[PDB]
């Protein structure tokens, strides 16, 4: 989604699963066109990954599984 409009869409870091949240808080953290409560990413990883040619969640996923195996090798 962020690829299509990088200047207006907010990058999501990860999902929030917190039992302690009330409904107002869940509503408050439901942002950046997410279905549930999420944290906006401020690490600039989206910008970085987009610049270096990644365009799909499948590519990001394949990157993550490779890095597990690369961590495993070390």
């Amino acid at each position: 989604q962020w690829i299509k409009d990088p200047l207006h869409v907010r990058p999501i870091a990860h999902a929030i699963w917190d039992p302690h949240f009330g409904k107002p808080a869940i509503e408050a953290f439901t942002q950046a066109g997410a279905n549930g409560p999420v944290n906006i990413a401020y690490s600039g990883v989206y910008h970085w990954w987009y610049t270096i040619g990644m365009r799909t969640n499948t590519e990001l996923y394949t990157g993550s599984v490779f890095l597990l195996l690369f961590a495993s090798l070390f």
């Binding site: 999902a15 699963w17 917190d18 549930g36």
Partner: protein
């Protein structure tokens, strides 16, 4: 797959601490 959050967050929150603190407590008090 979202249901995994309902499993993992409680495990990392309770099961892992209890298991880790229980073991480390028994290890530091072992004579």
């Amino acid at each position: 797959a979202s249901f995994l959050s309902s499993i993992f967050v409680p495990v990392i929150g309770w099961v892992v601490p209890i298991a880790t603190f229980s073991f480390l407590f028994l290890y530091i008090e072992r004579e």
